[PDB]
């Protein structure tokens, strides 16, 4: 395949043109996003039951919905969570391989079977099935300071939202806020003045605000002679607050007509009143633009910003827009980094080729054949249906090194032949290709073998490995192809003959460098001859080095992905149980004035009455958004340092409640998180106090008796708060004339909201809700003095029936797989790994009698399955590499000479990581580098490069010995021949990965991890192999 | 960043 | 023909009528085949109930809504077995009672007392000119011609 | 354990676990889960001049769920410090009840 | 029932249409309403886009927005259709009795 | 279920039952006297022999 | 049309090892285009006559 194309340069150029065109057409049809989708399909229900507690909501809605979901094909597990706010969710997680759309369609079809059995209110509001997965893109914020949050929410929903949905690439826009509604604030004192009731208001509003369908004149079964037809029209709906206030509640025989304004006050309000957002202290209304699968992120951000700048000319006075956070600047920075590394790699390879080969027409072949390799890689990526994302671009950055090593190898061999034998370019190229073609094919096979297993993993880490695996493997295959077709023809046609005796005559810097490198090579071959002289000593030294490397490797922490400074910090306020929204707002204002002081924080968003750890009136959370990294270049100006400073200030000044700032993980869905999440269930429905007692007994068993860093272990629910319970004595309630329908009516009307009807508000329908005035809803006496009408119409005090009283109760419920559950957390301190810790906790839960079980949660479900897949895949890859090398060398013994250079790279990488951790623990803050995904990728890369170098050395030494030399002579001459290209490749690749070694800014955590691994692996492994591979060959040939 | 969904914000 | 500046229905209708007018008299289209596609807007009967007087004369509003609906519209009451199939029973006034506008202008509603209270007093019937069709195309209001 | 108790336990614990296994198309219990059975007597209805709809309505109206609300709701007056959930049973759970 | 073209449109058809953006493979949309109280929304995808995946995605986008539509609409329901609109044959049954 | 396996499903059911037996009340046992996969497994074993 | 021309050029350049004979072969398309266009025009004129 090489001699065919050395004689057909135009044919080679045509195939490269086709590859270039395919790569460009692939680049132009690839979705651009920040991350791929790694989490598994999840669907949620989100029912609404206003006024219901955790127990009522759960038992009457969520359990009923959930016990109809077993059997939805693909169900992994199932969860349920209700709180005291009137909203609950069922969350079904499906196994991978499942279709999110078919899953959601099946969940909806199952819900339809039981929708009738739920309460009438839950049916009025409706249950909303939806997929959890989100492709978040941007956040929009409208701040006014002059108009309420209701007017801003309405303006947004009517004018700004329906125009962002229309932009190309937008897959969904969500407005965070309650819509408008006609609110009626009844006064019970005035109601009892006239002897009316809440049912009167509800029925009157439902009877006087109704839609009329009149019909038509001249309908189809008509009389002979009808000439005209016409649709009749009537308007029976109310539209304003005055018309609603004019509703008639009772028409007297006298004609007085008491109205709805007599007993209430009617105005436009909101639906819930629960949450309240603020940006830097001023009111805001936020949206959430989300990208669509197969959409470009940068184009969509640009279009959204332009559309908003156009719309801003019609904003009311005082309003303004702002996009504080945007997840397209990440992929934009990644693309810019790819381009910059490509250009600097071109410069480095130019410098190296000119310094060593000492001519300019040598530095034009790599410049031509590397971009074509990357373009073919882009083409393959596009074919397989992937996207352009942070991980794909890191893969390109990594593969650039191998793709330049290929060209360096080929051109250096050709130039060596041309200079040593004074041959023309065609003959020299033919000879060089005859020498290196089989080796190139074998190297490509070995690289494919070692990169395949990265794509055959399972879980979310499997999806993260697939990116690197596929990108790098495709790029490497295309590089090998281009090395066998286009590089030989380019060398044959561009290179010029070297006059016999041309070299050794240079008079300048070039002659000095030539002499210097000649002396260095002589010294190197002398040292390798010495190393080969004594074999047992060097072999025992090698065994020691390999065992020490394995040791340093095993004694290395584990992780998934390091936390990165993505620009923002999250905050979670929490007040004592029973607090109100006013104290929470005061505490949030304190937090805002604190975050204003920190000069690294630019914006701060504040949300009240909501938190990821439950939703309650005494909860809240903020979002501190930091400046651009360009301004945050200092010791204490990264995300973690800002989090620490903010937590310190909070603990210092916060009067009511506490708050903690944290830097979230990179992958929000399935990203590295720490801890052994647990879900303690009870199979026998023993109760809540019993399950709580068992949870506390387990926490006690774990805290001190076990080995779990007793500080970290914690309960993960929501502490019980005092409640107000009303026993109803049915015996005494029946001694008098009080029934049980009126008791329920009074109790449910005194304190909760009521959805009665809808009305048309300037184009769109909205809800009409009745509820008491605030002054009748505040003290516990507003429920104890609730008189109920007996059978004779008269009122009766509810103290003679109920006997209200205080008690401590649960403010949150949770089910897991159909059983009441209670979450727990923990972490093994050090030296104990997750395996034996989880076995210990399982035995602990076993100690607790039957009726109580442990179910793993979150990432522990992935960590529960043994890590045997990794070992199996790596052993199979090693066997495949051995088989390929045996096919290449035609021996069963020689492959052992190349399989002995894996310990070297492993030792190098592990020692570099450990040394960086020491050097940054002595002078730095904390050990930041561990054995994570990026370590695995960089280690596989260094292993591939070292295997390539060793393959070439061994294949050169095997041919020389065949010519009639010894084994020592063959190894010596092979080392002396391979010395220069190894040095060139090492120089280039190491100086290219150096910019990853000091990465600072966007995503520099993974960049620093991979840079450290690759740098130290390459350096140490090369320094060792350069001397040991000849020895491996010698001992493997003398042993057999 | 309100109404049940936090958002990266 | 889309309108993107939200100029209303009358303006778009006028623009479509002028476009139809110059598509004829151009020579490229043969006239009598250039036609506006959507169904034409025609006059309608509007009933304007007066809640103030409807209440002064002791007339409910559910009563007005039942009267108006029953006079001109078929109701689907129940199902009956017809030769081995459940089919629909439907109630409706006979043709003589729902042909003219006087048949709806002369309705009466039960007073609390049980009296007639003609709809001519607690309402006002009049002729309008309403839209028989509203079309959109790609998010904007459109009008079809050919 | 009686066969009714075992049928109830099966329906509650064993059947859901089995019908969410990969490959199970559907599980059928040869029996039924528990319920509260009222065995009316028509001659007694007549001695008191009652009906069957009388029993139906008396049951439906006295065994309802009460969703009470909360003290200190979101649209509150200035100076409210504490909230609290209200709770009333409303439902029946035993045969004597 | 009983809604004009404008009310029907602005209350149901615009609500559905706006959400139906972003569906994978959509070419253009078009709605239509009448004084009878009956409108439609037609979504035309690109050829080479499968009918079944398109229908499932459209159903899922419709269910999410269904909760907001009026009460009479939810009661009657929104039906989906993916059949042609041009005739193939016309069968005429005739008789004299 | 259409597209379901008999041997895999029977094995999974019996394993889940062995696990669930830990929480049974006192005196309750389980057993599958009618199982349609034993024949499949014995037939495959005989054929392999 | 441009894709067809480019494909012909590239395939011919590969098969015959030249960047010139593909040019010579691509100079013959305008003749076919002139023929086809003139034919359509002339038949239109004849039928109108
Ligand atoms: C895509 C289109 C790529 C171009 C077609 C393949 C050309 C390269 C090989 C053609 C060729 O004849 O080379 C000989 C066969 O190669 C062989 O060793 C047998 C064919 C192996 C090359 C097949 C390439 C397919 C993958 C291309 C992507 C050299 O070897 P020889 O000693 O048989 O000389 C006999 C010469 N006619
Ligand atoms: C990406 C694809 C880019 C390439 C696209 C190619 C499009 C058609 C080009 C065909 C050119 C073939 C020229 C081969 C050399 C001429 C034939 C020859 O004498 O080779 C001796 C042996 O041929 C042989 O041994 C057989 C060579 C067959 C080559 C077929 C190439 C795949 C088409
Ligand atoms: C002596 C050394 C000489 C070396 C050889 C010359 C150097 C070559 C350097 C340039 C690299 C090769 C040319 C690649 C150009 C980019 C091609 C992209 C084409 C694409 O977008 O697809 O198709 C498919 C879609 C079909 C329908 C869409 C078509 C869109 C219209 C395309 C019209 C432009 C191409 C045809 C006319 C050129
Ligand atoms: C040499 C030929 C390239 C071979 C290696 C290319 C690696 C960098 C290519 C740029 C990249 O990765 O993403 C592109 C960035 O878009 C862009 O803005 C173009 C980047 C400039 C071209 C690449 C310069 C060579 C480096 C396409 O991403 P996209 O989908 O957003 O572009 C939509 C265009 N229709
Ligand atoms: C559903 C059914 C599934 C069926 C599954 C079938 C599984 C069987 C797969 C067999 C795979 C065999 C892999 C062979 C790897 C060979 C690696 C070394 C090849 C090599 O570079 O040696 C050159 C020979 O060139 C060559 O010609 C190498 C050609 C190797 C092509 C790979 C095959 C030396 O060439 P030289 O430099 O000594 O002259
Ligand atoms: C003309 C120039 C065209 C440039 C781009 C061509 C890209 C076409 C796809 C590559 C050929 C298929 C290679 C292959 O093994 O199949 C795919 C890789 O398999 C795997 O998933 C594992 C292997 C992944 C790495 C393989 C890298 C090969 C890159 C191509 C090397 C070419 C060298 C130059 C001739 C599996 O795809 P599928 O069939 O299972 O499903 C289809 C999903 N859309
Ligand atoms: C990683 C895999 C390591 C395997 C090392 C085997 C080396 C055996 C060489 C023994 C020898 O004396 O030659 O012949 C012989 O008989 C050599 C033994 C046969 C080797 C077959 C290798 C298949 C590997 C499949 C696993
Ligand atoms: C309309 C179809 C056009 C097809 C492409 C036309 C390209 C014409 C180039 C002809 C150059 C004149 C011949 C010549 O030898 O000079 O020269 C040299 O040594 C360099 C010649 C490089 C020509 C490369 C043409 C690649 C076309 C790729 C299109 C994609």
From TrEMBL, chain A:
Family per record: Belongs to the resistance-nodulation-cell division (RND) (TC 2.A.6) family.
Keyword hit for Disulfide bond: no
Subcellular location: Cell inner membrane
Domain of life: Bacteria
Membrane topology, record value: Multi-pass membrane protein
Any one GO BP annotation for this protein: response to toxic substance
Assigned keywords, A-Z: Cell inner membrane, Cell membrane, Membrane, Transmembrane, Transmembrane helix, Transport
Protein name (database record): Efflux pump membrane transporter
Residue ranges constituting the SSD domain according to the UniProt record: 368-493
Chief location: membrane
Transmembrane segments: 10-27, 338-357, 364-384, 390-411, 432-456, 468-491, 536-554, 871-889, 896-913, 933-957, 982-1002, 1014-1036
UniProtKB/TrEMBL annotation, chain C:
Residues spanning the signal sequence: none
Compartments in which it is found: Cell inner membrane
Similarity comment: Belongs to the resistance-nodulation-cell division (RND) (TC 2.A.6) family.
Protein name (Swiss-Prot/TrEMBL): Efflux pump membrane transporter
Species name: Neisseria gonorrhoeae
Boundaries of the shown chain within the full protein: 680 to 825 of 1067
UniProtKB/TrEMBL annotation, chain D:
Subcellular location(s) per record: Cell inner membrane
Superkingdom as given in the UniProt entry: Bacteria
Homology family: Belongs to the resistance-nodulation-cell division (RND) (TC 2.A.6) family.
Protein name in UniProt: Efflux pump membrane transporter
Span of the entire protein shown here: 147 to 243 of 1067
């Amino acid at each position: 395949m090489a001699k065919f194309f050395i004689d057909r340069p135009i044919f080679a150029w045509v195939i490269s043109i086709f590859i270039i065109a395919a790569g460009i057409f692939g680049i132009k049809s690839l979705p651009v996003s920040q991350y791929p989708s790694v989490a598994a399909p999840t669907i949620t229900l989100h029912a609404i039951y206003p006024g219901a507690s955790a127990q009522v909501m759960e038992g009457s809605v969520l359990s009923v919905i959930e016990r109809n979901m077993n059997g939805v094909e693909g169900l992994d597990y199932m969860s349920t969570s209700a709180d005291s706010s009137g909203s609950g969710s069922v969350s079904l997680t499906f196994t991978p391989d499942t279709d999110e759309n078919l899953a959601q369609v099946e969940v909806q079809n199952k819900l339809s079977e039981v929708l009738s059995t739920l309460p009438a209110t839950v049916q009025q509001y409706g249950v909303t099935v939806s997929k959890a997965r989100s492709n978040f893109l941007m956040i929009v914020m409208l701040s006014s300071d002059v108009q309420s949050t209701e007017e801003m929410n309405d303006y947004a929903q009517r004018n700004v939202v329906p125009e962002l949905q229309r932009i190309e690439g937008v897959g969904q826009v969500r407005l965070f806020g309650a819509q408008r509604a006609m609110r009626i604030w009844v006064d019970p004192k005035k109601l009892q003045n006239y002897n009316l009731s809440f049912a009167d208001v509800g029925s009157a509003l439902s009877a006087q605000n109704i839609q009329i369908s009149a019909g038509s004149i001249g309908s189809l079964p008509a009389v002979r002679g009808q000439t005209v037809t016409a649709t009749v029209t009537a308007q029976g709906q109310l539209g304003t607050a005055e018309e609603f206030g004019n509703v008639i509640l009772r028409a007297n025989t006298d004609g007085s007509n008491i109205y709805l304004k007599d007993v209430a006050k009617v105005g436009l309000g909101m639906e819930d009143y629960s949450s309240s957002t603020r940006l830097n202290g001023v009111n805001t209304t936020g949206m959430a633009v989300m990208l669509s699968n197969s959409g470009n992120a940068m184009a969509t951000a640009k279009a959204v910003k332009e559309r908003l700048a156009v719309l801003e000319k019609y904003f009311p006075q005082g309003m303004s827009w702002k996009t504080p956070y945007d997840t397209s600047k990440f992929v934009e920075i990644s693309i810019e980094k790819v381009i910059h590394t490509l250009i600097e790699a071109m410069v480095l390879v130019f410098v190296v080729m000119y310094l060593f080969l000492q001519n300019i027409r040598y530095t034009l072949i790599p410049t031509i054949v590397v971009p074509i390799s990357l373009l073919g890689g882009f083409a393959f990526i596009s074919y397989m249906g992937m996207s352009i994302n942070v991980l794909t671009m890191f893969a390109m950055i990594l593969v650039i090194g191998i793709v330049v090593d290929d060209a360096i190898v080929v051109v250096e061999n050709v130039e060596r032949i041309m200079a040593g034998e004074g041959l023309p370019p065609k003959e020299a190229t033919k000879k060089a290709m005859g020498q290196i073609s089989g080796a190139v094919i074998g190297i490509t096979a070995v690289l494919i073998s070692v990169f395949v297993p990265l794509a055959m993993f399972s879980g979310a880490a499997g999806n993260i490995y697939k990116q690197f695996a596929l990108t790098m493997a495709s790029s490497i295959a295309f590089s090998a192809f281009l090395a066998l077709t286009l590089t030989p023809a380019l060398c044959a046609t561009m290179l010029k003959t070297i006059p016999k005796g041309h070299h050794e005559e240079k008079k300048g810097f070039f002659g000095w460098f030539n002499k210097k490198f000649d002396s260095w090579t002589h010294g190197y071959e002398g040292r390798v001859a010495k190393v080969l002289r004594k074999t047992f000593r060097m072999m025992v030294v090698y065994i020691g080095l390999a065992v020490v490397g394995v040791f340093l490797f095993m004694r290395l922490p584990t992780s998934f992905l390091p936390t990165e400074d993505q620009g923002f910090v999250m905050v979670s306020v929490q007040l004592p149980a029973g607090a109100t929204k006013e104290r929470t707002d005061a505490t949030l204002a304190q937090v805002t004035q604190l975050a204003k002081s920190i000069p690294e924080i630019e914006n701060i968003i504040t949300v009240s009455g909501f938190s990821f750890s439950g939703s309650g009136q005494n909860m809240a959370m903020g979002f501190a958004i930091l400046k651009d990294w360009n301004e945050r270049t200092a010791s204490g100006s990264d995300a973690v340092a800002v989090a620490g400073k903010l937590t310190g200030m909070m603990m210092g000044t916060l009067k009511d409640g506490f708050g903690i700032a944290v830097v979230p993980p990179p992958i929000l869905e399935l990203g590295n998180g720490s801890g052994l999440s647990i879900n303690l269930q009870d199979r026998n429905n023993t109760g809540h106090t019993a399950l709580l007692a068992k949870r506390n007994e387990l926490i006690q068993k774990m805290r001190a008796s076990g080995l779990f860093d007793p500080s970290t272990v914690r309960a993960g629910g929501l502490e019980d708060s005092p409640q107000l319970k009303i026993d109803i004595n049915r015996a005494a309630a029946a001694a008098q004339g009080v029934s049980f329908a009126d008791i329920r009516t009074a109790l449910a009307s005194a304190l909760s909201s009521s959805y009665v009807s809808d009305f048309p508000n300037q184009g769109r329908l909205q809800r009409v809700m009745v509820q008491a005035d605030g002054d009748a809803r505040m003290q516990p006496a507003d429920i104890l003095n609730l008189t109920v009408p007996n059978s004779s119409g008269i009122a009766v005090p509810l103290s003679s029936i109920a006997t209200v009283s205080w008690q401590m109760g649960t403010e949150q419920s949770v089910r897991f797989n159909g059983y009441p559950a209670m979450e727990l957390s923990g972490s093994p301190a050090t030296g104990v790994s997750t395996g034996q810790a989880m076995e210990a906790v399982q035995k602990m839960v076993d100690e607790l009698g039957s009726g109580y079980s442990l179910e793993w949660g979150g990432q522990s479900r992935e960590e529960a399955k043994g890590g045997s897949q990794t070992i199996a895949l790596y052993a199979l890859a090693a066997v495949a590499v051995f088989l390929v090398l045996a096919a290449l060398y035609e021996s069963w013994s020689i492959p052992l000479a190349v399989l002995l250079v894996m310990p070297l790279g492993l030792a190098g990488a592990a020692a570099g990581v450990t040394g960086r951790n020491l050097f940054e623990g002595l002078l730095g803050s904390v050990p930041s580098f561990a054995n994570d995904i990026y370590f695995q990728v960089g280690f596989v890369t260094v292993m591939g490069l070292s295997a390539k170098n060793a393959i070439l050395i061994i294949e050169f030494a095997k041919d020389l010995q065949a010519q009639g030399k010894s084994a020592v002579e063959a190894a010596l001459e092979a080392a002396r021949l391979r010395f220069r290209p190894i040095i060139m490749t090492s120089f280039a690749f190491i100086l290219g990965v150096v910019p990853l070694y000091i990465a600072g800014g966007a995503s520099s955590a993974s960049q620093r991890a991979i840079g450290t691994t690759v740098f130290w692996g390459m350096l140490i492994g090369t320094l060792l192999s350069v001397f040991l591979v000849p020895l491996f060959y010698v001992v493997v040939r003398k042993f057999f | 960043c309100t109404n049940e969904d936090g958002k990266p914000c």
